């Protein structure tokens, strides 16, 4: 079968250069293959490589600068791009054509698990957690603003509170910088009953946030 | 290169339904077309090969079919797990290109949404930056409207909107609209309005709030 | 006829590999692939991620009897495998016969 | 070779194809070069490489610690231990030397019939409208545009489409 | 050293998927076989001719 | 295929011929049906069966019991008897799985070379009496009854007999 | 035979040539006898030369005495023992009799390959100058003297130089 | 690789006859010639045989006199010539077609 273990996320700015691993689980010849896929946009295929007929076929594209390449004895792939830029902030896979027929070249066949690059020149900025205290039914939430990279972890009551609960996507402000919000909707009774915390978690900068969402009062 | 170009591009359907994509290429491909289905934070999962030929592991509803230059995909009934985007590739000729994407909905009543407005925190006004965030819980379709209302006057590219993914109990989105004043125009008005228009409301509904109080 | 000839053919390159057949020995092809493995990092590793278990100046019988010239694991330890060096001397310092240390040693390999 | 296309009537490889294994080289009035059968060349590499990974992956192997410690009174079962250590190095190198020197000779064999197939391949679709010359090569008695050469590198050639063309043009180079 | 691996020898590790080795017969872990042989090429491509003449 | 015959220029295989593995397809003005060649059948019949046996046959093995008891201070002979099995248990998997694979790529190709076989003795038989039409058939240039037919799957065609009633017909066809 | 030449459209074979595998026959106003073909023979004796030094000299052993003695009281060591010996001879015979098995019957193709392609080689050299009338043989529709006839031989016979005088003869026997 | 040790050096009277070993270090099936050098005279081969074809091919000269022989176990091969005469004092050298190619039968490769 062999499982495919890509190496982890990792986070540059623009100019710089990156090499994703694909390690196998056993050892295979299988093609390989190296797809991407950016935030809000298609899958694009970006090269390959044939282990017995060498070689490295890319797209027009990437052609320059990508560099793809494997090791035999590891059964490792790797793929490198050079002249990083704010275009190439995406997740890249790395899949191997295998199919219960055999090499069949062409078809992606087993795919990785991804690999999320970012490039922006902003560096590791911690998050900012200010409580949007509540005014049928009410709703309160926290706001994760202005922090680098991706991704915070938001729960609530430390996972008490998952009902109702609604984590939006980070957005890229016009900084350079990801804001997220956390709302969650609770009966009007429980407002002063029962307490609530956001438990915002960002380890890239090694924040945790623990912020009482009191209910605001004139 | 071949342009891989997915009809429709975007649909929805209420589980058990009859499911039917069609791809189309500029040139011949003959049948060197695979159909792949992407999920959300999940790898890429490839399901026909060669137009035909249903991968080990994938139920025997995904049938694929085709050649020349029109490709076409079927499910015989619609189920929750393959509720997802599907891409059509060719591997006629390098480049390899993928589809343009064809994303999957579960059908639902129309629900009018739920619309909350929070004024900036009295502990972020210190930081010297507003954010008024107004919010849409629970609503369908996924298309709507939002305008911020400043003093009557709409403030445009100072907002930004996220949308969450449909949720699996009860299939609807929720929205955030997050428009973000420095602490000095902030003040420089006292109403803020957030007027949304959306299928499941008769007329925009519209909440404000009168900064100070 | 107005010449328009089409002809057919095989790829080659300038490739050095040399590969041995049944028929003849060091045929040249365009491709090939190494099915064998002749390198080693050269240095011993953590086999299963536990690190292995050394002992240095001391034998296993010095190390598990407490020779004075031999550490001890005071925390709780762990390894895959034990490494000792043929320069290990400060065993049994007080002559002796220790029963059973080969399957000792196994019992403790790991 | 043993089916007599490479080395054979096919005297020569061309290193002027760099996109694939087997092609072709034409030639009319808009030019000439050198194209990649793209359908036999990826059955070629796909079947190398089951070859490949089959030699590799049918190797599986568990957890297991060769060595074995014994004092100087138990020669006997040392020598056992020895022997079976000896005999396991003997097997395997005869095989895996066996394996290597079996599976290049079949390797090389299986490109001399793909570009044998190849050439036939082409002689069933022009028939009498193309002249054998050797050296895997045909010659036209058709003039043969761009679209009738990439055609035959389909494998949509029209031989009626021509035929008459072409048999008008068979019987004046003859006398 | 503090690097990871599948296989050990007493000349040093082996980070390979390759089903024959001929580094030391003696080795603990996953490890592939141990052989004499000293040349073990496979050829995928066919018989190089370039030669003009 | 190797031979290029099975799934090559015969491009599918025949449901409708069950007594035999190659065989014909005729028409004529007495009908039309599928027959088995038989010579060429049981011959390769007879190499698959000898192939089979080859495998079994020569597997010959004597009374044995693997079971070795050790006791807790037996464990290092008791690591050699287990290297000892585990050994083996590598050594024919690989084998067994490899033998399977080379052999069962030998068996198909031995399939493709007798159906590529018969069409060429088929084809020598009939010589410019009959013309290639591709898919591995055969039209004649002469009218060919059931006699004739069998004949041909006898192996006894006789090409003077009507070499002149085909060259007649063959010069008229083409204009 | 795999390739159709030895023992399929050349029904046997010549005790009159002994001088090599692979030759010709031919006859002319001059006489007639048997002559091999030196290039085809040599590159087939060194093939089959590589193939038995391949099978011996991949066998590369050490010095080692099989013989190993135990008591009474130790009779699971012993049957460990022997059943270690068991075990390699089970591989080894397997093996060994597979091997041969499956190489000699690559031979045997091999020879037929090689027959096939001289048989060929000659085909492409006369072209339509002569006439396929079985049994892997040809006949010149011009006059062939010892000086012809071994330039096929020798590999440089001239299709041009006799392409008008055996054109002119072939519109006349076919009348 | 294997190695070629022939016999030692024998001297005999006219009309004896005379056979010559030639062991090989190793085992293989490779092609056996035999070649003389006269005193002050230039080489000459002697004759022939190839063990995977049988028969023993000699020259016009020495036919009827030399037998050149090879056993297939031992890999040793034997050159036994009868009728011995003083044009036939000199040294005889033993050789094995073969080079990286292989048999390459024809060149004398390895000689003794
Ligand atoms: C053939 O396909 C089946 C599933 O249909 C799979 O179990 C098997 O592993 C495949 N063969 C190989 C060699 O992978
Ligand atoms: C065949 O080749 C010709 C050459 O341009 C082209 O017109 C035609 O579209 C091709 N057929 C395909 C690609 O299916
Ligand atoms: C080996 O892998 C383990 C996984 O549990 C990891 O904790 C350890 O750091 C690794 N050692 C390395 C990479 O040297
Ligand atoms: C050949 O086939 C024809 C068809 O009937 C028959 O007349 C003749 O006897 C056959 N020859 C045999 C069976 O030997
Ligand atoms: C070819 O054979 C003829 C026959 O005698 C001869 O004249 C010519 O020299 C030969 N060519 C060679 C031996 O190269
Ligand atoms: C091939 O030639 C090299 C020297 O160029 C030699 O080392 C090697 O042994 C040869 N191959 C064989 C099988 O003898």
Same mark, same amino acid.
């Given at each position: ?36 896929? *950016? ?30 390449? *494997? ?61 949007? *205290? ?85 | ?213 | ?110 | ?175 | ?53």
């Amino acid at each position: 079968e062999v499982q495919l273990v890509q190496s982890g996320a990792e986070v540059k700015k623009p100019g710089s250069s990156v090499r994703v691993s694909c390690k196998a689980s056993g050892g295979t010849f299988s093609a390989i293959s190296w797809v991407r896929q *950016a935030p809000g946009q298609g899958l694009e295929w970006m090269g390959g490589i044939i282990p017995v007929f060498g070689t490295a076929n890319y797209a027009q594209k990437f052609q320059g600068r990508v560099t793809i390449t *494997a090791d035999d004895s590891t059964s490792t792939a790797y793929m490198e791009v050079s002249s990083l830029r704010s275009d190439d902030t995406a997740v890249y896979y790395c899949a191997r054509e295998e199919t219960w027929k055999g090499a069949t070249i062409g078809v992606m066949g087993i795919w990785g698990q991804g690999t999320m690059v970012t490039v922006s020149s902003a560096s590791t900025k911690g998050p900012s957690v200010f409580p949007l *205290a509540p005014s049928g039914t009410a709703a309160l939430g926290c706001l994760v603003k202005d922090y680098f990279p991706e991704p915070v972890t938001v729960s609530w009551n430390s996972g008490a509170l998952t009902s109702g609960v609604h984590t939006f996507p980070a957005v890229l402000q016009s900084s350079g910088l990801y804001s997220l919000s956390s709302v969650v909707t609770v009966p009007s009774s429980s407002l002063g009953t029962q307490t609530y915390i956001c438990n915002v978690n960002h380890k890239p900068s090694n924040t945790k946030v623990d912020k009482r969402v009191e209910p605001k009062s004139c | 290169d071949i342009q891989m170009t997915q009809s429709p591009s975007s649909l929805s359907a209420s589980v058990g339904d009859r499911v039917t994509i069609t791809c189309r290429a500029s040139q011949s491909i003959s049948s060197y077309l695979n159909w792949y289905q992407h999920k959300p934070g999940k790898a890429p999962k490839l399901l026909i090969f060669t137009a035909s030929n249903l991968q080990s592991g994938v139920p025997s509803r995904f049938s694929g079919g085709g050649s020349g230059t029109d490709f076409t995909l079927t499910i015989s009934s619609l189920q929750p797990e393959d509720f997802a985007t599907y891409y059509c590739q060719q591997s006629y000729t390098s480049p390899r290109t993928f589809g343009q994407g064809t994303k999957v909905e579960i059908k639902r009543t129309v629900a009018a949404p739920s619309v909350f407005i929070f004024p900036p925190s009295d502990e972020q006004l210190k930081s010297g930056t507003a954010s008024v965030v107004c919010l849409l819980n629970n609503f369908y379709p996924r298309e709507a409207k939002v305008q911020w209302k400043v003093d009557n006057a709409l403030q445009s590219g100072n907002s930004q909107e996220s949308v969450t993914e449909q949720d699996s109990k009860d299939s609807t989105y929720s929205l955030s609209s997050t428009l973000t004043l420095s602490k000095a125009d902030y003040e420089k008005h006292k109403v803020y309005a957030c007027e949304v228009t959306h299928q499941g409301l008769s007329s925009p509904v519209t909440k404000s709030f009168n900064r100070g109080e | 006829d107005p010449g328009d000839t089409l002809c057919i053919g095989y790829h080659a390159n300038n490739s050095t590999d040399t590969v041995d057949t049944v028929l003849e020995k060091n045929v040249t092809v365009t491709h090939s692939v190494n099915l064998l493995e002749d390198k080693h990092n050269g240095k011993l590793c953590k086999l299963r991620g536990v690190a292995p278990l050394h002992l240095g100046k001391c034998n296993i019988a010095g190390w598990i009897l407490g020779n004075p010239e031999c550490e001890s694991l005071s925390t709780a330890s762990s390894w895959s495998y034990i490494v000792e060096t043929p320069s290990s001397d400060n065993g049994t310092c007080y002559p002796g016969d220790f029963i059973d240390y080969e399957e000792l040693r196994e019992q403790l390999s790991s | 070779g043993l089916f007599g296309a490479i080395a054979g009537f096919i005297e020569g490889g061309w290193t002027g194809m760099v996109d694939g294994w087997y092609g072709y080289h034409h030639q009319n009035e808009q030019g000439s070069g050198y194209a990649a059968d793209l359908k036999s060349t990826q059955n070629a590499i796909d079947g190398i490489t089951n070859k490949v990974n089959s030699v590799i992956e049918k190797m599986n192997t568990q957890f297991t610690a060769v060595g074995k410690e014994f004092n100087h009174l138990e020669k006997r079962i040392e020598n056992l231990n020895k022997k079976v250590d000896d005999g396991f190095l003997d097997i395997w190198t005869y095989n895996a030397e066996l394996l290597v020197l079996l599976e290049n000779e079949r390797t090389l064999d299986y490109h001399d019939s793909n570009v044998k197939n190849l050439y036939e391949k082409v002689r069933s679709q022009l028939k009498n409208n193309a002249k054998e010359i050797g050296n895997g090569c045909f010659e036209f008695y058709h003039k043969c545009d761009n679209t009738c050469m990439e055609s035959v590198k389909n494998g949509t050639y029209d031989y009626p489409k021509y035929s008459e063309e072409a048999k008008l043009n068979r019987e004046e180079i003859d006398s | 050293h503090d690097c990871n691996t599948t296989c050990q020898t007493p000349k040093g590790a082996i980070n390979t998927s390759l089903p024959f080795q001929n580094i030391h017969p003696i080795t603990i872990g996953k490890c592939p076989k141990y052989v004499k042989s000293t040349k073990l090429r496979l050829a995928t491509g066919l018989r190089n001719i370039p030669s003009i003449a």
